[PDB]
Amino acid sequence: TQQLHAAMADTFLEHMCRLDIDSPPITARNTGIICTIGPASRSVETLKEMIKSGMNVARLNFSHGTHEYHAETIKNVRTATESFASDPILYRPVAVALDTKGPEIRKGVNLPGAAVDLPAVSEKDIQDLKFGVEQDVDMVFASFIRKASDVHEVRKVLGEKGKNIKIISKIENHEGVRRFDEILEASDGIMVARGDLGIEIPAEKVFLAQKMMIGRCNRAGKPVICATQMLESMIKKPRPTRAEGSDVANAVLDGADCIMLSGETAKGDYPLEAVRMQHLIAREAEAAIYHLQLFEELRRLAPITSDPTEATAVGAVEASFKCCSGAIIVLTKSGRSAHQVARYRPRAPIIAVTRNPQTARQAHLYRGIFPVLCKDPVQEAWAEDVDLRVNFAMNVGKARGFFKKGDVVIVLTGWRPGSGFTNTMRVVPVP
Amino acid sequence: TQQLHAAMADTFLEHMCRLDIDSPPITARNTGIICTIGPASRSVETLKEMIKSGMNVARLNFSHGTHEYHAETIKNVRTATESFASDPILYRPVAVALDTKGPEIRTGLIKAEVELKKGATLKITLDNAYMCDENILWLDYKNICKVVEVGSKIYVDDGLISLQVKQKGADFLVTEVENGGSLGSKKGVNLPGAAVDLPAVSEKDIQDLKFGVEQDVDMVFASFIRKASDVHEVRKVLGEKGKNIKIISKIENHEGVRRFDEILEASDGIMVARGDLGIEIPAEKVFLAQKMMIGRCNRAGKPVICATQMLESMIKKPRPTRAEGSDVANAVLDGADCIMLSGETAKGDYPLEAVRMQHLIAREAEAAIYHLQLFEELRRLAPITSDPTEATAVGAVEASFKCCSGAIIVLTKSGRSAHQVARYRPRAPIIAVTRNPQTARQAHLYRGIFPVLCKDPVQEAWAEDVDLRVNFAMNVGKARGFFKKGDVVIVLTGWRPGSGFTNTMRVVPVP
Amino acid sequence: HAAMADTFLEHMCRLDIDSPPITARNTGIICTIGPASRSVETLKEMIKSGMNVARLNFSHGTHEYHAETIKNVRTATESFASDPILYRPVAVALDTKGPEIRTGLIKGSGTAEVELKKGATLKITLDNAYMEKCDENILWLDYKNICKVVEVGSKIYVDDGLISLQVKQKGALVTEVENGGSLGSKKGVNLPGAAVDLPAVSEKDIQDLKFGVEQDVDMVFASFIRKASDVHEVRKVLGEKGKNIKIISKIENHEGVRRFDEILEASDGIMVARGDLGIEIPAEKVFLAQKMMIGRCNRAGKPVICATQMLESMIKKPRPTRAEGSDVANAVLDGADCIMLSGETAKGDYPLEAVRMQHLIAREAEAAIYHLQLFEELRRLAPITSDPTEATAVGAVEASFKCCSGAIIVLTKSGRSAHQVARYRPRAPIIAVTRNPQTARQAHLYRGIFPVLCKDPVQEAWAEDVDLRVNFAMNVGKARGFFKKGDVVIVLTGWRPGSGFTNTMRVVPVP
Amino acid sequence: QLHAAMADTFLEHMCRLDIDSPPITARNTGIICTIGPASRSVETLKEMIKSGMNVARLNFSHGTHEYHAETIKNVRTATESFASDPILYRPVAVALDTKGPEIRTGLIKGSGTAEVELKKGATLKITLDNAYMEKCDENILWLDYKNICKVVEVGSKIYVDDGLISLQVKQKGADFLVTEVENGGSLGSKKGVNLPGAAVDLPAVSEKDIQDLKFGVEQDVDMVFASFIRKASDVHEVRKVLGEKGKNIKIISKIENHEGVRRFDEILEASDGIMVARGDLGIEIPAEKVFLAQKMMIGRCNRAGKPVICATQMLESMIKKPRPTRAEGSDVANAVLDGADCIMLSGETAKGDYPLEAVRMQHLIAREAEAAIYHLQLFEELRRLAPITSDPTEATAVGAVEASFKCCSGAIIVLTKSGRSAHQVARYRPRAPIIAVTRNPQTARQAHLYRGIFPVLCKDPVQEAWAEDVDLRVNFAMNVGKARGFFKKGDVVIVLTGWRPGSGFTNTMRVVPVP
Numbered sequence A: 001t002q003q004l005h006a007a008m009a010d011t012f013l014e015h016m017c018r019l020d021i022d023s024p025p026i027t028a029r030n031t032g033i034i035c036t037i038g039p040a041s042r043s044v045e046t047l048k049e050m051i052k053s054g055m056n057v058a059r060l061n062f063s064h065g066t067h068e069y070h071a072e073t074i075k076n077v078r079t080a081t082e083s084f085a086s087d088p089i090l091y092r093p094v095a096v097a098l099d100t101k102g103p104e105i106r107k108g109v110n111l112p113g114a115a116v117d118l119p120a121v122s123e124k125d126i127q128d129l130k131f132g133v134e135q136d137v138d139m140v141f142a143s144f145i146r147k148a149s150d151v152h153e154v155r156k157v158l159g160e161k162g163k164n165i166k167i168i169s170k171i172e173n174h175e176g177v178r179r180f181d182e183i184l185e186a187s188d189g190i191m192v193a194r195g196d197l198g199i200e201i202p203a204e205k206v207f208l209a210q211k212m213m214i215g216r217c218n219r220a221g222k223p224v225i226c227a228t229q230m231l232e233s234m235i236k237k238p239r240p241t242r243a244e245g246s247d248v249a250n251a252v253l254d255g256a257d258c259i260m261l262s263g264e265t266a267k268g269d270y271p272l273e274a275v276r277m278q279h280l281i282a283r284e285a286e287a288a289i290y291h292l293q294l295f296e297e298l299r300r301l302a303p304i305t306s307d308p309t310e311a312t313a314v315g316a317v318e319a320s321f322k323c324c325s326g327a328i329i330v331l332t333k334s335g336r337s338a339h340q341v342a343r344y345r346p347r348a349p350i351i352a353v354t355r356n357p358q359t360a361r362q363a364h365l366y367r368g369i370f371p372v373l374c375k376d377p378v379q380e381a382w383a384e385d386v387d388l389r390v391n392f393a394m395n396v397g398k399a400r401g402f403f404k405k406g407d408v409v410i411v412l413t414g415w416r417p418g419s420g421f422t423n424t425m426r427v428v429p430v431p
Numbered sequence B: 001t002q003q004l005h006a007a008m009a010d011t012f013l014e015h016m017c018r019l020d021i022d023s024p025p026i027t028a029r030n031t032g033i034i035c036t037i038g039p040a041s042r043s044v045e046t047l048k049e050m051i052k053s054g055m056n057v058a059r060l061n062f063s064h065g066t067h068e069y070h071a072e073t074i075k076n077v078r079t080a081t082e083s084f085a086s087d088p089i090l091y092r093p094v095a096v097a098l099d100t101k102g103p104e105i106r107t108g109l110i111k112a113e114v115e116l117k118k119g120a121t122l123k124i125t126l127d128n129a130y131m132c133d134e135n136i137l138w139l140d141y142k143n144i145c146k147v148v149e150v151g152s153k154i155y156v157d158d159g160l161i162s163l164q165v166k167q168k169g170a171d172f173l174v175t176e177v178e179n180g181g182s183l184g185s186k187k188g189v190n191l192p193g194a195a196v197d198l199p200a201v202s203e204k205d206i207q208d209l210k211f212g213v214e215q216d217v218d219m220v221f222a223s224f225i226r227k228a229s230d231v232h233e234v235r236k237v238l239g240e241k242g243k244n245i246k247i248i249s250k251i252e253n254h255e256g257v258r259r260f261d262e263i264l265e266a267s268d269g270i271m272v273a274r275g276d277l278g279i280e281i282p283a284e285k286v287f288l289a290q291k292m293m294i295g296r297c298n299r300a301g302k303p304v305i306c307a308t309q310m311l312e313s314m315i316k317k318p319r320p321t322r323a324e325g326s327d328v329a330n331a332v333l334d335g336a337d338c339i340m341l342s343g344e345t346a347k348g349d350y351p352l353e354a355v356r357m358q359h360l361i362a363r364e365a366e367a368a369i370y371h372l373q374l375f376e377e378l379r380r381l382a383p384i385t386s387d388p389t390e391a392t393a394v395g396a397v398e399a400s401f402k403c404c405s406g407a408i409i410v411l412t413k414s415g416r417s418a419h420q421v422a423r424y425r426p427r428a429p430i431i432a433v434t435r436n437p438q439t440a441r442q443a444h445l446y447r448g449i450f451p452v453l454c455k456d457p458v459q460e461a462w463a464e465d466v467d468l469r470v471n472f473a474m475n476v477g478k479a480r481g482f483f484k485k486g487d488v489v490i491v492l493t494g495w496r497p498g499s500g501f502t503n504t505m506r507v508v509p510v511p
Numbered sequence C: 001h002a003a004m005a006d007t008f009l010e011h012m013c014r015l016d017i018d019s020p021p022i023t024a025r026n027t028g029i030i031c032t033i034g035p036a037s038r039s040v041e042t043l044k045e046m047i048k049s050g051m052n053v054a055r056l057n058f059s060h061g062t063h064e065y066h067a068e069t070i071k072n073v074r075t076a077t078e079s080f081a082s083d084p085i086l087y088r089p090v091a092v093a094l095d096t097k098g099p100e101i102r103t104g105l106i107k108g109s110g111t112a113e114v115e116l117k118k119g120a121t122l123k124i125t126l127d128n129a130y131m132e133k134c135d136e137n138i139l140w141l142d143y144k145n146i147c148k149v150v151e152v153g154s155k156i157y158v159d160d161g162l163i164s165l166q167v168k169q170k171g172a173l174v175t176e177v178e179n180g181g182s183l184g185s186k187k188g189v190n191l192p193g194a195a196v197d198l199p200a201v202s203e204k205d206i207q208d209l210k211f212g213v214e215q216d217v218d219m220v221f222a223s224f225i226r227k228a229s230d231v232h233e234v235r236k237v238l239g240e241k242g243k244n245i246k247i248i249s250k251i252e253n254h255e256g257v258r259r260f261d262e263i264l265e266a267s268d269g270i271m272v273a274r275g276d277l278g279i280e281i282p283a284e285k286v287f288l289a290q291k292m293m294i295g296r297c298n299r300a301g302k303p304v305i306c307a308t309q310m311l312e313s314m315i316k317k318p319r320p321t322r323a324e325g326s327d328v329a330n331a332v333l334d335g336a337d338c339i340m341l342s343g344e345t346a347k348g349d350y351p352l353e354a355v356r357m358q359h360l361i362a363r364e365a366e367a368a369i370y371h372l373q374l375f376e377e378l379r380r381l382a383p384i385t386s387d388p389t390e391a392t393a394v395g396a397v398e399a400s401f402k403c404c405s406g407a408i409i410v411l412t413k414s415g416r417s418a419h420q421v422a423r424y425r426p427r428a429p430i431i432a433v434t435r436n437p438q439t440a441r442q443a444h445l446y447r448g449i450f451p452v453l454c455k456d457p458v459q460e461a462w463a464e465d466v467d468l469r470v471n472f473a474m475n476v477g478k479a480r481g482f483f484k485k486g487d488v489v490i491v492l493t494g495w496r497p498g499s500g501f502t503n504t505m506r507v508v509p510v511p
Numbered sequence D: 001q002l003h004a005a006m007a008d009t010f011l012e013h014m015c016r017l018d019i020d021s022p023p024i025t026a027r028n029t030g031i032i033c034t035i036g037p038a039s040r041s042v043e044t045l046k047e048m049i050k051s052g053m054n055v056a057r058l059n060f061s062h063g064t065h066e067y068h069a070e071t072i073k074n075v076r077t078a079t080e081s082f083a084s085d086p087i088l089y090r091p092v093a094v095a096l097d098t099k100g101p102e103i104r105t106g107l108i109k110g111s112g113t114a115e116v117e118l119k120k121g122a123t124l125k126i127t128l129d130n131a132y133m134e135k136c137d138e139n140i141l142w143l144d145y146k147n148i149c150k151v152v153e154v155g156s157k158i159y160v161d162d163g164l165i166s167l168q169v170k171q172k173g174a175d176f177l178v179t180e181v182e183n184g185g186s187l188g189s190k191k192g193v194n195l196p197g198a199a200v201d202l203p204a205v206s207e208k209d210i211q212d213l214k215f216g217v218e219q220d221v222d223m224v225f226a227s228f229i230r231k232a233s234d235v236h237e238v239r240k241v242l243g244e245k246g247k248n249i250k251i252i253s254k255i256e257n258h259e260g261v262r263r264f265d266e267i268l269e270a271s272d273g274i275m276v277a278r279g280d281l282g283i284e285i286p287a288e289k290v291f292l293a294q295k296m297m298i299g300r301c302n303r304a305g306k307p308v309i310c311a312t313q314m315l316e317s318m319i320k321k322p323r324p325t326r327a328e329g330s331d332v333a334n335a336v337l338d339g340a341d342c343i344m345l346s347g348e349t350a351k352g353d354y355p356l357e358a359v360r361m362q363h364l365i366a367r368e369a370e371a372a373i374y375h376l377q378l379f380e381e382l383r384r385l386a387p388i389t390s391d392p393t394e395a396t397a398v399g400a401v402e403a404s405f406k407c408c409s410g411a412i413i414v415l416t417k418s419g420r421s422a423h424q425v426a427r428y429r430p431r432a433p434i435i436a437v438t439r440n441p442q443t444a445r446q447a448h449l450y451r452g453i454f455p456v457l458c459k460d461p462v463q464e465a466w467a468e469d470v471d472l473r474v475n476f477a478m479n480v481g482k483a484r485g486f487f488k489k490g491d492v493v494i495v496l497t498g499w500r501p502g503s504g505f506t507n508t509m510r511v512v513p514v515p
């Protein structure tokens, strides 16, 4: 009863009328969880407890701290992550995100609708960005991105050694919102950094820009993060306010791909509980999603394509709703084939099984993608290697309770090795 | 343009206003064409031109003719069909359909016509050997007294003459002529409302169906079905020798309309037989029954046939009326899988012009179909399947619109996998490749399915064998102009030979 | 049950032939008056059966002949003027001949249908020496400039598109028959695709329009409108004495369809003249043109008529065909304001039967209309307005759906207040009370409007005069069965006497 | 947000949300404010009326009858301070929040301010013997629920101090409980206790509530916020206690437990309104499910046309800070986008340091969220789900709303005596404000519970001719509308009247230009 009665309502109002607090959700949680790591959670042993509580991405705020400090944070993060590698099935990749300092003023001061002469990427940012490339980070949260000319300046700094590092522009000013479209078309994703946004724009208007930015990225198929202050009271209290709970649930209902925690995990006194709460609420909001309107409106807004993979993805999502599938298993190398299934927001989890660890780590940016890293070696026959990576996803889904033997799942593959060829959709029962 | 400008509309109204007569239909014709064969089309030379003009199913009306007669009809249809079998790429399968006689009621030989004045008195007698003047007519039993009663009305000769039982009668019946006119010999009489005690499959029908199974018919049009047991009574007579023969129940009276749901469940398809239905139920209500039965079969994924008087005036004139051109087009927009011609091709003076006209109207109407709404509502009114073939067909048709593919190539042994794709009505044509000739001939009942018979022998490697059939569809799709090399098509496959395993869908480039 | 459906597909499945329609037929019925219906006795029964608008076809007959018909129509109309509660306004429509191309007399004989051999040569000469000397080898047409419009082996259609030819000559033509037939004296010629340069309003149309103003006709059916300038030429010809006469532009050729927007913009309404349209454009595309023009006029709130050959077989048979039964219903479902009858009531054998059938089918079709989508779509596509009348109209239509009212009573001098209500297509009838006789007759053009002519004198207290006409509508609604006492109706009045000023909507109980 | 409201889809409507599209002047969402020490001065209460307060709430969980009678007198004096100008006077209703079945602890170490430090994993005994009643410490805790043993089994969870402290039982002794602390902290005196998933056999209407309700009827309040209604019979007990003298006062059921939501439909049919009461609800049910219950309740009362309020912790951070939380900003807006009739403030106005900024912030966010409402979808779904009524006013109301959208009416002027006609118009959520004209002060105050109804109380005397009395008020509404900036001269307004004096006869809709 994953709010399936509400998902069959002919109207959006009756769908709300049918929401049932006694109807439990599916064990799979589709929204990524980004926890800012700091003094309260840098310990290697407590980082393990945060992975178990559902952390997907470890955020590193570079507004303070030295490279020697952040390298120890990354060292322990990876130590906690690989502590579960003694198990390929239940292992879970954890990403490393670099939030740059950006154009600041420092105690930090703020100035609304003004010019901000500071450059997009100063030498402090360049030395921090090149540090991330050396540390093998998975993504960059570029702060105070005001125009498209800033993302290109950041992309050039990362260079070709980190060409595959995904850039997440942080909308933090009024100019960034006013010029959001050229920023989104230039970025790998967007973060709605409500923290600094609520000071530059009127606080009563932050919800307008958040829902606008999430929708526009939702139609564009790009990840969007809701950031800062979702459970701020949890910094000193073990339970969030009613407003904070509904904020996390509404961000997931708005369509945000990941939800973020900053002070709640960096310096607060209840970092484990804040991660556990965000996991619980996001899973509940995923059940309350009105997929009947979401899947239709996303398809109607999406254009016709000559791309075989895009056509397979829509058909795969349409097939999953038809048979209430346990998961969408997608063989992917660069994550792209999994990203194209995610943009149509299926209900079932997207078990994106891959061999590239960086794509498994970057998979958390997208809603509903559950990456699994296959350490098995390539078989001589390609057919055997494809079905091996699919059976690897079957064993994972059974262990993580995503589905059981006899259930129906959709498997996405392609006709030849290499990337951009995902074009084969199969409806197979779980062995 | 294929009326794609009107397809990208939000409202049905704006979609109606965007309809363009200068928007040429690029797609093939998706609606099946059925044509009754008669003295105007029995010849081989005529039948080949009917195939060229678009005939997908040959209907044989067994209320007239003899087994010897119909046997030569079938022989000529099969001769005309296989005359195009030289090239298997362009070959078109043509099915043969037996239209059961059913529980009809005719009159006696007059004294060739006569005249019954309006308001006069006619004593319908059930006497012995009077099998007829302007006062005393004889029926084929019907047991009219046991089913007739008060001021009941009898309709002689296709409802053109209206009677009115104005008495009771021991073995006769005194009636007043509610609507006059002439009267030929042995004309059919309909008794609306009443429950004709005649059986489901009469002794004549048994010999007909047993003859049809002995002649390898592809489907039967069961006349005057009223209850679900009638379809079972017909399927029993077909037995195990003809268990693969589709049963299309003809809905023709108030009972068959009321009991429609159980009839649809027991039958393989429905024919909206508007001819007799227009006599048994008020003629102004037929469009309601027609739209009701088409939508319900569309909901149930069963074929539905719109039949009779679609191009009636084309029996004597070379062009249809404006009402007839719009009736065919609206039957397509209603959702009819097939359309039918009766006297237009059986005994008319322009049978070819009729088939060509139905092919032309249907192709334009398929462009005017509001696919944006039809597809969403068809999926909404369909339940969660747990069947891999059903889910595969939904994604295939979803990928059909997304990539705007030129065709849906489906490998099918019994047609079922193709029927499940056509259920969701893709704009793109369904190229169903089969090695089973009967499955190719029966695929015509389904809208949008272009069956193609692959006569190539089965290959040893199963991967290479289904590849050979996928290419076979690629060649017939490029030969008939459905798509060119480099286009995107949807190819439906399964994971092992035999039927029931269609589970693979691919978007592959046309070679 | 059908109106309460979340999907259009389920709306079709819930279409019940056992749900009796409401008492109110909303689609106007336009009957062409001819030799079979000119008698006052027959025109009386035509009004009783449901004729709202009498149409005179000025393609034939003389002014003396039509003036007698108009006299007979008004005699049969005022035959019921004694009780103004049951009296039905019946408008008179003038159908212009327009730029018609006709042939001569065959062998100088007005009723000598000659012959034509499929493929035989036929001379198309302009030499007036063959005017009353047409033979099976030489045919004369009255369009002297045909050779400057028709050239590359083009197609020429004679006798309602039945006979088609292919010219093979030049200079003031050798026709090669492409479809044989039987010619006749003074039959119509169509030149599809070619640009006929004939004047919009010929010297003959001037005399008919002058006659029409003198005869106090309510609307003109301007045949063969090619552009908006033609509509303006008709409007100027009518002048001051001819204003208030509604101009219905007949769309009959490719040019009128291509320029439909400018033509509609300058017209009072549109008539889908499928007869000629089916010859000028391919007959398969006519339904696209009809549905396009019906949708576009619905969006604009202007009347649209679907015409010619709706019940064509009823010229000779008392019962229509199934194609004809569905064409009338689909016209109403398309959203046609009026359906028309031409030869069926002018020269046919069953004029009354044809009017009753159109009434029956239209009333059944009005019930089956999916109002949930139509009222929503017609509202979405309609823009916002500062006009209080427009705001009061939508509010009144939404109110009538909410309380399921029996009627929507509107007082109007011009008719406009009633027209703005009918644009949003309520289910309940619109009883437009007026003291203006022409406004009552012209109201027949709009769907759902049931005009009543109040003849009681105007009271001194305007409020009492307003309340008087409201009670008059209550009386006719009670008398005609639209609603009973205790039911709820919507009443629309204004805040001051005079036209416009309609801003009051009151939900009142029927006394 | 006229561009977002024209989108054919919800997604595009969200993408079209312009942060630079200024809202309308009218704020359609009622603002309820709990009155307390930081809000009781009539100098302050005047400032809250001017900052947007429409309903003043009295939490009868604490305080005595003489204390609350002072607040009411202080509230009423603040409102009548504006009655000098009838064209701008804003009615302010007062509301009585009952205590309900409440479980409070005892005094710690004989003080009211003393606090002990509890530690997770430590032990704490819960006894019902009235001896330790004012001798609580980290070892013995007393609570005033006598039968707190015939409900709590072994291993259950008892929550103390607004759910901040968690206990885990381990032993039951009829009179004692040897629990264990799961989450510790400073334990105070007389803190609230929450027992989730237990048949609290305490009555919904206590003897203290029966006296507080009779005090409410005597004090001429406008509505009753009853607490912890588990069944409709509880609403009937409140209804009977109010009797005939209090027959007009609205009963607003606060759902605060698992039984309330499970029987919400039966409760909503028995009440005149609903309060979500998220505070107690987030403790009795998992906090991650509160948004589900809130959305379900707001939707079901929208489908029914009854008022629903979102309460507790909407701007909680503003108790100590002058600027709210983005989550709190997102929460007020999303409550307005959910369709909540009114939004409430509890600690932010009762004891907070910035009560005025919270009222202003709520009025700001609600004005913005009202513009972002997808009126195209809402008005269609409300009509498709509302029945075909035989009432002439329901048809007039939905007909005026459809006409309001058609001409973009500046407002919908409604003449109402019992407010029922303004309620019927509000049920369909027009964008334009509902200027409701009444001579009934009880009506002009109770109209704040419904969204979009801007109540105006006409103090002019009844003219001799009834048709002249209607035009006098219909002209008063445009005076209020022209002044408060809802429209100007020439704009088109919808006016709803009746054919006869007396309630229940409004059936006339008029599209008129403002003079």
Ligand SMILES: O=P(O)(O)OC[C@H]1O[C@](O)(COP(=O)(O)O)[C@@H](O)[C@@H]1O
Residues within 6 Å of the ligand: A331, A332, A333, A334, A335, A336, A337, A338, A386, A412, A413, A414, A415, A416, A417, A418, A419, A420, A421, A422
């Ligand atoms: O998701 P991506 O990066 O576009 O690649 C998906 C690819 O994975 C495959 O399943 C197998 O690729 P590999 O040979 O790299 O394992 C292909 O069929 C498909 O093209």
Ligand SMILES: O=P(O)(O)OC[C@H]1O[C@](O)(COP(=O)(O)O)[C@@H](O)[C@@H]1O
Residues within 6 Å of the ligand: B411, B412, B413, B414, B415, B416, B417, B418, B466, B492, B493, B494, B495, B496, B497, B498, B499, B500, B501, B502, B503
């Ligand atoms: O349409 P049907 O009756 O399910 O048949 C489809 C079958 O055809 C196949 O494509 C292959 O069948 P064959 O090898 O017998 O030709 C299977 O994948 C599938 O089960």
Ligand SMILES: O=P(O)(O)OC[C@H]1O[C@](O)(COP(=O)(O)O)[C@@H](O)[C@@H]1O
Residues within 6 Å of the ligand: C411, C412, C413, C414, C415, C416, C417, C418, C465, C466, C492, C493, C494, C495, C496, C497, C498, C499, C500, C501, C502
């Ligand atoms: O359709 P029209 O021309 O606007 O007629 C509506 C008019 O009729 C009335 O209801 C009454 O008009 P009269 O009584 O003067 O004939 C006016 O209030 C209104 O302006």
Ligand SMILES: O=P(O)(O)OC[C@H]1O[C@](O)(COP(=O)(O)O)[C@@H](O)[C@@H]1O
Residues within 6 Å of the ligand: D415, D416, D417, D418, D419, D420, D421, D422, D469, D497, D498, D499, D500, D501, D502, D503, D504, D505, D506
């Ligand atoms: O109290 P309700 O039900 O809202 O009704 C409002 C009433 O106010 C009126 O407009 C005028 O009544 P009053 O004489 O009390 O002013 C009536 O027409 C209507 O019945």
